[PDB]
Symmetry: C5
């Protein structure tokens, strides 16, 4: 029996190696296999990865006439001491178990141990949509010991920044992913003390041109279309009125359609500001002709009682586009 080469029953494996003395160092490496999904309303993401641990335990040393190591599956884990890592700020997680538990242990003749397992985790990520669709988001995954403070267990990245590897084909449907790197920081709990925490960081960006074409283009086109009425004969009332009211209806249907396709986040975003300013411009173009028609009727009635282009159209033809251009300059200087 291979489990008799390790004196399992001759040691108390409820205590850590080196108990009573200096803390035992534990090194960590991570390989990221895929990014599975992201939820903008609930603000979280899901990842699948391999987690590997390295440490030494003299109680597991065994004699050998060669330098070959012994390999075990997950059934040995319950018989020896292993580190208790957990994921901070996670919502749910599990260890894969088909066709059996995806866990491995390798023991060297001198007592060095490698511990490897495959896991899927869902973690929280606070997001800010104020600058949508030009926003940038930063996310992280955090690893910590549950029960051992830094006086008993010292947790560190085994090879610094070389400890993190990512799959060549990692991708998300609606985002671009960039800038993977690692950091470390100490955390304090008033209940028990100081702990080491490890971080994996990355950044997300959107495809700007899709949103420009889908949203900003039609609204600008409809605003430009509302300016055509300034060049139409003011005596053609049955042509001037329906054009304005139909332009208002078209802009309203565009805004409703755009609202239906964005994530349901109930606060003000940059694209909403652009759309509602455009709507106001279209509304004012109808008020302009109402004023023109009333003044012309008044003048004709006065002339008959006593017995060319109106100035308002001439000024509007210049004033409306200049104001829209100025608004665009200010908007794009503010929101980049």
């Amino acid at each position: 029996k291979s489990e008799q080469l390790l004196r399992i029953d001759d040691h108390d494996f409820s205590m850590r190696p080196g108990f009573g003395g200096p803390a035992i160092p534990v090194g960590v490496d991570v390989q990221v296999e895929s990014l599975d999904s992201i939820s903008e309303v609930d603000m979280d993401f899901t990842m699948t990865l391999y987690l590997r641990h390295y440490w030494k335990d003299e109680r597991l040393s065994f004699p050998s006439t060669n330098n070959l190591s012994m390999t075990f599956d997950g059934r040995l884990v319950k018989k020896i001491w292993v580190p208790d890592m957990f994921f901070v700020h996670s919502k749910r997680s599990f260890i894969h178990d088909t066709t059996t538990d995806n866990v491995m242990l390798r023991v060297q003749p001198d007592g060095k141990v490698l511990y490897s397992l495959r896991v899927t985790v869902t973690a929280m990520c606070n997001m800010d949509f104020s600058r949508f669709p030009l926003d940038t988001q930063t996310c992280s995954l955090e690893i910590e010991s549950y029960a051992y403070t830094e006086d008993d267990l010292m947790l560190y990245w085994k090879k610094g920044n070389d400890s993190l590897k990512t799959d060549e084909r990692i991708s998300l449907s609606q985002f671009l992913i960039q800038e993977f790197h690692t950091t470390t920081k100490l955390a304090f709990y008033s209940s028990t003390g100081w702990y080491n925490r490890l971080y994996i960081n990355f950044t997300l960006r959107r495809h700007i041109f899709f949103f420009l074409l889908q949203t900003y283009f039609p609204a600008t086109l409809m605003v430009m279309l509302s300016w055509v009425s300034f060049w139409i004969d003011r005596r053609a009332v049955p042509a001037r009125v329906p054009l304005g009211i139909t332009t208002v209806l078209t802009m309203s249907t565009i805004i409703t359609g755009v609202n239906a396709s964005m994530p349901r986040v109930s606060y003000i975003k940059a694209v909403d500001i652009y759309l509602w300013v455009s709507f106001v411009f279209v509304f004012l173009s109808v008020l302009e002709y109402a004023a023109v028609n009333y003044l012309t009727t008044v003048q004709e009635r006065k002339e008959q009682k006593l017995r060319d282009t109106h100035a308002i159209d001439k000024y509007s033809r210049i004033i409306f586009p200049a104001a829209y251009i100025l608004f665009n300059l200010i908007y794009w200087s503010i929101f980049s």
Copy 2:
């Protein structure tokens, strides 16, 4: 073996400490890690937290030449007595178990015990949407012993209002969160007796300006647009009629779009009252011109058989805006 320092087999751990005498006090602290989601149709919310217990048991005392404590994981829990807390009015819950069970026990030389675990819970919350979008909601999470009455177990907050801590970055996508605090109250069950219950309370609010801009603004603009027809020449029938009918169509599409984006709650809310009153105003503006056209035709026919602005337009130009202003004053005095 560390489990032989505690005389595990020398005591009956199916009975409570102090059995037969006064009740044993148990103190509780809570740390809230995140708020995961909220469901308005099903009326519930989800939270992740750390739960910690404090009590003393003389049967667990062990000799020591120093003042160091001993730490165990979840495997020891089945061998000793622990308190049986559960969450009242919950729908589902679980204890996290990656990479192992997230449970810890620490025992002092004199028998003081700390018991800590990490849990996720979904709890019910009755909501009232009568004042939407200006509504305010209050929610709570409740903790109680399953099997021990106040004569056997005395449950209390360990440090009063200092027993509750919350994460600095706790947030929800569509709500603002404020005013965390704790309370206690006694509950009675006719089957078994009186029990102590602990509460965690907080309040939720919406972003008002987003809803004002998205809903109240367009409806007011369309009502103001329907008043333009009162200043148009009454002889221009092919201009007056299509304008009114198209305004009605636009208002209908706005209301349908707004209904499509709110939570599916099937009873009358304040925003519905505002929208349908506005719709009625638009409808009456079309009836007004129908009456004007009929009366003018009657007069012309009578004059020919025998062989300026109509008064109705003049009165409507004043009466419609004043009534709308009065409705707004009453509405906003009622709904704040």
Copy 3:
């Protein structure tokens, strides 16, 4: 050890108390904590409750110098006989287990037993939507023994109609709940015999005024709007035609929007009958003017070749509203 006060190993607990003789009576009480959700397309509902059992077993009697009882958790259940209740016509269910199994046993000195547990269940409920939105639904939850016929186990409500309690704040988002009560009935299985079955009954209703305002009001308004054309000068063709076609478009958009917001049930309901009759009325109003225009043109051409209000408008002004009123009287006398 408390489990040695009960002679656990001195009895066969695979057989029922009173084996070989008369059936053992078992009394039941229920406390309903909440109603969690309802699904109209799948026709089911979800509930959380406390289930309590009462019976006597002389094999569990123990000596005592007082009248104190002994309390155990779920670990003792596997060592003694307990009743095997299950929920008839259910789709899924589970027993809550945080922070431990929510199960309790209390044993009196003379052998009386109380058995209590907390459970969540999803149960089927056939619904009929013919009269929507004026429909009423009745639902039930059923409890039965799996393996014991009425000759071996007699199941009954412990205190009649006083055995059922409900929470003061029980509610559903889209329904009103009323009339909780209990019944019993005998059921027959050809495979094994007769069994006792217990029932919990309740009724659901909708909020009528919300549906009236959202659906019936706009359709009636559009039908009334289509009657305006009967008072407009028949010589104004470019005003009469667009009005009718735009009214048809508006009614179509209303019907599509209403269909999008109801539960996806694919058979004919009362509200569909009302909407499509209204649509037919709007269609006929356009055919009327087509006939009027053709006849007028024919008359003018005939008069020129040889070289006031048309009767159809005069009759339509009376006939259309009277027919609509008659339809409403018949509809509301049929559907209440």
Copy 4:
């Protein structure tokens, strides 16, 4: 102890009864409790049922002074041999376990055994939507032994067609259910040999009148409405043009609304053919008036330079309805 009346430890229950000789016959009965749901996009359905097995085993015979049988729950199953049935072509399944495992065993004095359990299963069903909404679907559930060929285990329906019972109130929200019956057939696996397979068959149909009223009626009405323009004076251009373009807009909104309410199946169905032919008819009605207006203008210009009803309208008034009637005759002769 009742388990000592059966000599459990005196037999090897890892081998089948009759090992080494002829195959052991096993009879099956099924009772269907409900149909829980159906998914058209994923092509599967869910059912809850009772499964019962009958066979004889002389090793379980016990002496008795009467003819009473002994009953056990699921804990005995692990100690004896039972048949290993599984569901072919299923996606997921489970055995109900509240308040305990829903499993029963009854043993007669001579060794006859009844084995009963309650299960829920989701099974695949390939569907064809070419003739929607006039399609018919056939579904089946299949039962087979995992490890025993027909040389070792003979599986059959215990009472032929009387072995299947269904609940009196079985129903689905959007389908009608008819024609339950059973069949059997032999299946071959190249890895191990021939196996017996049992089938449960049934048929599904839709409610035709709901779909006729919701889809076919409005499209026919709009096609008939487009024919009104053929009777309007050709000199009324501002009446003829807007009518045609608005009819096109209305038909487009109807088609979009209809597409939004059907299951998302991305290939051509019969109702799509009907809708797009109707759309083409509406388009051609606008081209007709364009031609008429151009020809009239040409004639007037020619007459002035040199210095009644147009034939196209007269022919269209006859030709359009006859072609639509012919299309309807062909369509309904093809699709029933």
Copy 5:
């Protein structure tokens, strides 16, 4: 006892057969039962299959007077050595367990073993939607040993390309499936070494004609409809203007409806290019008439102050269709 014919307690089954020498070959066969679902937003697919293993172990040989083999269920697996296969790049998986675990073991007298189990797996598949709806996708499922390198375990397809079988009725609702085949390749891990990997490959395609009819047809029809205005009398302003604005509204509603029915992928696809070019064509047709009307008014005013078809219409009647045809030729030569 059949488990005593195999000397289970006489061997260490924590080590592989042939330990210390050449690697043990393991052959694999696969039978695919169904394809359950596909998710375009999350980029994954789900499959159900049978997995079979073949190898030899002299420690399991048993004496026999015949050539009959012995069969066991899943309970024996924990007592002997078996290979540890797992699925690479998977998100979740499980082994079916109704009515018991779907696992079988067959052992020949000379020690040959067959190991069979039924499993469901969800696997990732990166997709590219640039050419939608004319895109083609390729997917794969991968199998590998967790803990044994190629020096200890040699994994191969048992019968080459004949090792893969697929069900005759395998189908997906929205895709066509073709070209199943197998491959193999060696993979390197810096942590432990070289491993053998097996692949199952297949291809997916869409139904092109459904998308052509639903999307490309209406847009082309509306572009052709906008050209009618070039043949209408330029003096009929109240006919020319509303036609153009209503055509713009119709095209906008078509684009919104089409966007609502495609998978929510936020980057530019081929069908979007076609739709927005068509929209631009419709917009330019309105600008054309604006210019014509202004120039005519200028000429009339000049002539009166001093006291036929306009050229722009004549050129547009030719230029617009030729440009649209050229765009179509380029588009369909690029996108096939």
